[PDB]
Amino acid sequence: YEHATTMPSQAGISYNTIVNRAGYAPLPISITPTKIKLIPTVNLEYVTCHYKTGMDSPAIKCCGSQECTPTYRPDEQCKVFTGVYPFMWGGAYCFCDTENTQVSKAYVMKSDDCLADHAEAYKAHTASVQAFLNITVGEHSIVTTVYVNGETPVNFNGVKITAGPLSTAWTPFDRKIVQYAGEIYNYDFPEYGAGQPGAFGDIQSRTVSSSDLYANTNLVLQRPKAGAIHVPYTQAPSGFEQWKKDKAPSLKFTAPFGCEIYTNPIRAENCAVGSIPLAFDIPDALFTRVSETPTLSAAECTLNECVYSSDFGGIATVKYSASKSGKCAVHVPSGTATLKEAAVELTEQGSATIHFSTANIHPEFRLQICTSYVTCKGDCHPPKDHIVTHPQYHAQTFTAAVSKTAWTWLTSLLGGSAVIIIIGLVLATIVAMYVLTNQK
C-alpha cells in the first residue's frame, strides 16, 4: 500500500493520521519529530584573532649609515633614522654626536592565544535537513534519524518511509557567517586578502595552524625619542577586539521562526517553518481484514467538557456496543479537532473517553472509530490562562470562533435585508402587473 501525507515541521508535537482501505481495518500512524536539524555545508574561509606587533631590536650603527633590508613579513616595515644619540644604563652608546643611524623594523604576527581565542569566517550554503522521528505504525514503534532529502528511504519491518524534500528552502544562515565562542553571527566579513585596518579580518590566516598571514593594520614607524632605544610605531587598534565590542547579538538570539543555533557542527534546530512530506510504503501484512477487527455499533458522543485551549482542552465520552474487544484507530477526518490518542482500547460494552483539542467555540465533528462515524457536538468555553508555554496543538479555521449569537445577528442583517428586497420586488411586480392588466 502507498500513502502520501504531509506533516508540519513543528518539533515536539505529535501528529496522527489514519489509513483506510476498501476491505481492511483502518490503521493509525503517529509521527513525533523530537528534533529537526538544518546543517549547511560550510567552508572555512579564514581565521581572525588579535594581532601582535613584533619589533626587531633596533640596529644602531655609530658614526655610520645603514640600509633597509627588503620586506618579507606580514605588514613588515623598516626605516632608518639618522642623527640618533642612544643611551643605555652604562651611558652614551655612540661617541659621534651626529651621523649615527638606527634601523627600526616592525611586523605583525598572530597573538599567542590565537589557538583558543579566534573567530572562524565561513561561507555557508546547501542546507541539509534531518529529523528524529518517533514513528508508530501498526502498533510498531521505532525511532529514526531520517534525512529529509527526497532520495533516501528508511526501512523497518517491511515499511518504507521517504521524507522530504522540505517545503521551504529558507535558512537562518546567510552566505557568509562567523563562528566565535560557540555562537554564529551573520557577518559580511572581507574576503581573504581584502582585510582593512581597524575592522574584522584586518589580519587573516587560512587555518589556525597555517603558516600564512595577510596583515593590514596601518602600521607606521615613528622617530625614536632623543636618547632612547626603542621602536616607536602607530597602528590602527585591533579589528578583532573592536568587532567584539560591536558584535550585536548572535543568531541564537536574532533568528526567525524560533530556530536554535548550535555549533560543532554549525546547525539550526527546531525551526517552526515549512512542512515535511512523507511517503509511506506499507506491506499488507500489518493490515487486517474488517472481520478480524472489532466492529462498532450503537455509539454516541457527548462533550462533557470543552475549553478551546492550546492543549487538549476537551474530553469526549462515547457510549459503545462493540462486537468484541480490540483496538480502534480513532481519528477525526476533519480539521475541527486534534486527537491526543491515535488508538483506543475497545470492549464489548461501555464508555470510552477521548482527549481532543479544538479551536471551535461550538464544535461539531465526525469522530471516526474502527468502522463507525459518530457525530459529536457540544460547546466550549474560553480558558483560564491568557498566556501558556506551549504552541497550539489544534488549527484555527476562518469560522472557528464565531459563536452562534453572531450567526443569528449576521443572518438577521445579511439575510433579512434580502428578505426585504424580495418583498419589495414582489410588491413592485404585483403592482406593475395589476396596472398593466387594468389598462385595457
Partner: protein
C-alpha cells in the same frame, strides 16, 4: 524597569541575563462575551480579530442601509404607479386600491 511586550499565537521568547530563554504563546481568552448583547459581541470580536470586524461590520451596515433604501424606493414607486392611474381622475375616486391594500 517595566517592559510590556505583545505575545501572539505564533510565540515570543525572552532571555533575562544568564537565565535560560523562556517562551510564551498567546491564547484566545478575552475580553467580552460572544453569547451576549450586541455591544459585548462587538467588543469580543474587535479585540480579537481586529480589522476583520471593522471591515465586516461596516460592510454589513452598508449592505443593510442600501437594502432598506432600495426597498423604500421600490415601495414608493409601486405606490405611485398604483395610485396615479386612480389619482388623476378628475373626480378622484380611489376606493378599490385603498380597500385591497390601504396604500394611502
Amino acid at each position: 524597569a517595566v517592559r510590556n511586550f505583545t505575545v501572539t499565537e505564533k510565540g515570543w521568547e525572552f532571555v533575562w541575563g544568564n537565565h535560560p530563554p523562556k517562551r510564551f504563546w498567546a491564547q484566545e481568552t478575552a475580553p467580552g462575551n460572544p453569547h451576549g448583547l450586541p455591544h459585548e459581541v462587538i467588543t469580543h470580536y474587535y479585540h480579537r480579530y481586529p480589522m476583520s470586524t471593522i471591515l465586516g461590520l461596516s460592510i454589513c451596515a452598508a449592505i443593510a442601509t442600501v437594502s432598506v433604501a432600495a426597498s423604500t424606493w421600490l415601495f414608493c414607486r409601486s405606490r405611485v404607479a398604483c395610485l396615479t392611474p386612480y389619482r388623476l381622475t378628475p373626480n378622484a375616486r380611489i376606493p378599490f386600491c385603498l380597500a385591497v391594500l390601504c396604500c394611502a
